[PDB]
Amino acid sequence: PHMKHPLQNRWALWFFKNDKSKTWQANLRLISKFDTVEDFWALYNHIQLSSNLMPGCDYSLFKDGIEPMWEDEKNKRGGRWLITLNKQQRRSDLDRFWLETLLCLIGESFDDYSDDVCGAVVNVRAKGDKIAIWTTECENREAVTHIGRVYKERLGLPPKIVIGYQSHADTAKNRFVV
Amino acid sequence: MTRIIYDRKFLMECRNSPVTKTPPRDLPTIPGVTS
């Protein structure tokens, strides 16, 4: 007897401001947690679009229990599929790419490999923006590759627009490419 | 008992429900995010 449609996972949306005059903990804020489709939209419909965030700010969506940091047990051996965007793309592509990324997460769009997904992050910066899907194990070639291929497909990227997977250890080159 | 999967079509459709027009009750007040 569900009135709202339940998700496979409970998710937490975070906000972060890269203020290096403060502590990491002070810069991080939980916006809300949700576990249904309708509650996701209620949240999305009442927060700022990524394109309108101040430079130096992040949004991140992570499974409940995973801290939005690569030091987390779930993120330490992991990596990310990285989407790089020009600042000029901010008003045309950033929001539609971010939302599609969110829908891939809460929709469990990667079949069984969706379990390897930890979360996603969007970085708004003066130099240029970034969207990324974080996965838990950079060595899981099969899982990582499937996620990358479906992601590229869902973003509607043409074949010639190649995206790379970077392990967090290296980020601190591409392991894979689709 | 099986994994819950939603395609894009279904998720976009759910947005038309009136309950989505109501803000989260415990939505924090943050300038430039929720303002």
UniProtKB/Swiss-Prot annotation, chain A:
Biological process per Gene Ontology, one example term: G1/S transition of mitotic cell cycle
GO cellular component: chromatoid body; cytoplasm; cytoplasmic ribonucleoprotein granule; cytoplasmic stress granule; cytosol; eukaryotic translation initiation factor 4F complex; extracellular exosome; glutamatergic synapse
This protein's UniProt keywords: Acetylation, Autism, Autism spectrum disorder, Chromosomal rearrangement, Cytoplasm, Host-virus interaction, Initiation factor, mRNA transport, Nucleus, Phosphoprotein, Protein biosynthesis, RNA-binding, Translation regulation, Transport
Keyword Magnesium part of the UniProt annotation: no
Compartment list: Cytoplasm, P-body; Cytoplasm; Cytoplasm, Stress granule; Nucleus
Chief place of localization: cytoplasm
PTM info: Phosphorylation increases the ability of the protein to bind to mRNA caps and to form the eIF4F complex. Phosphorylation also enhances its mRNA transport function.
UniProt-annotated site: (Microbial infection) Interaction with potato virus Y VPg, residues: 127
Highest taxon, organism lineage: Eukaryota
Coiled-coil regions, chain positions: none
Sites where the protein binds mRNA: 24-25, 70-71, 125-130
Region named EIF4EBP1/2/3 binding: 5-8, 41-45, 100-107
Alphabetized GO MF terms: DNA-binding transcription factor binding; enzyme binding; eukaryotic initiation factor 4G binding; mRNA cap binding; RNA 7-methylguanosine cap binding; RNA binding; RNA cap binding; translation initiation factor activity
Subunit structure: eIF4F is a multi-subunit complex, the composition of which varies with external and internal environmental conditions. It is composed of at least EIF4A, EIF4E and EIF4G1/EIF4G3. EIF4E is also known to interact with other partners. Interacts with EIF4ENIF1/4E-T; promotes recruitment to P-bodies and import into the nucleus.
Involvement in disorder: Autism 19: A complex multifactorial, pervasive developmental disorder characterized by impairments in reciprocal social interaction and communication, restricted and stereotyped patterns of interests and activities, and the presence of developmental abnormalities by 3 years of age. Most individuals with autism also manifest moderate intellectual disability.
Note: The antiviral drug ribavirin relocalizes nuclear EIF4E to the cytoplasm and reduces the elevated EIF4E levels found in acute myeloid leukemia patients, suggesting its potential use as a therapeutic agent. Ribavirin suppresses EIF4E-mediated oncogenic transformation by binding to EIF4E at the functional site used by the m7G mRNA cap and competing with the mRNA cap for binding to EIF4E which leads to relocalization of the majority of EIF4E to the cytoplasm and inhibition of nucleocytoplasmic mRNA transport.
Family: Belongs to the eukaryotic initiation factor 4E family.
Protein name: Eukaryotic translation initiation factor 4E
Organism lineage string: Eukaryota, Metazoa, Chordata, Craniata, Vertebrata
Full protein: residues contained: 36 to 217 of 217
From Swiss-Prot, chain B:
Modification Phosphoserine occurs at: 17, 35
Description of post-translational modifications: Phosphorylated on serine and threonine residues in response to insulin, EGF and PDGF. Ubiquitinated: when eIF4E levels are low, hypophosphorylated form is ubiquitinated by the BCR(KLHL25) complex, leading to its degradation and serving as a homeostatic mechanism to maintain translation and prevent eIF4E inhibition when eIF4E levels are low.
Residue numbers of Phosphothreonine PTMs: 2, 22, 29
Modified residues (Phosphotyrosine): 6
Motif segment (YXXXXLphi motif): 6-12
Record cross-link Glycyl lysine isopeptide (Lys-Gly) (interchain with G-Cter in ubiquitin), residues: 9
Subcellular location: Cytoplasm; Nucleus
Function: Repressor of translation initiation that regulates EIF4E activity by preventing its assembly into the eIF4F complex: hypophosphorylated form competes with EIF4G1/EIF4G3 and strongly binds to EIF4E, leading to repress translation. In contrast, hyperphosphorylated form dissociates from EIF4E, allowing interaction between EIF4G1/EIF4G3 and EIF4E, leading to initiation of translation. Mediates the regulation of protein translation by hormones, growth factors and other stimuli that signal through the MAP kinase and mTORC1 pathways.
Assembly information from the UniProt record: Hypophosphorylated EIF4EBP1 competes with EIF4G1/EIF4G3 to interact with EIF4E; insulin stimulated MAP-kinase (MAPK1 and MAPK3) or mTORC1 phosphorylation of EIF4EBP1 causes dissociation of the complex allowing EIF4G1/EIF4G3 to bind and consequent initiation of translation. Interacts (via TOS motif) with RPTOR; promoting phosphorylation by mTORC1.
Note on domains (UniProt): The TOS motif mediates interaction with RPTOR, leading to promote phosphorylation by mTORC1 complex.
Family: Belongs to the eIF4E-binding protein family.
Protein's name according to its UniProt entry: Eukaryotic translation initiation factor 4E-binding protein 1
Species: Homo sapiens (Human)
Source organism phylogeny: Eukaryota, Metazoa, Chordata, Craniata, Vertebrata
Gene name of the record: EIF4EBP1
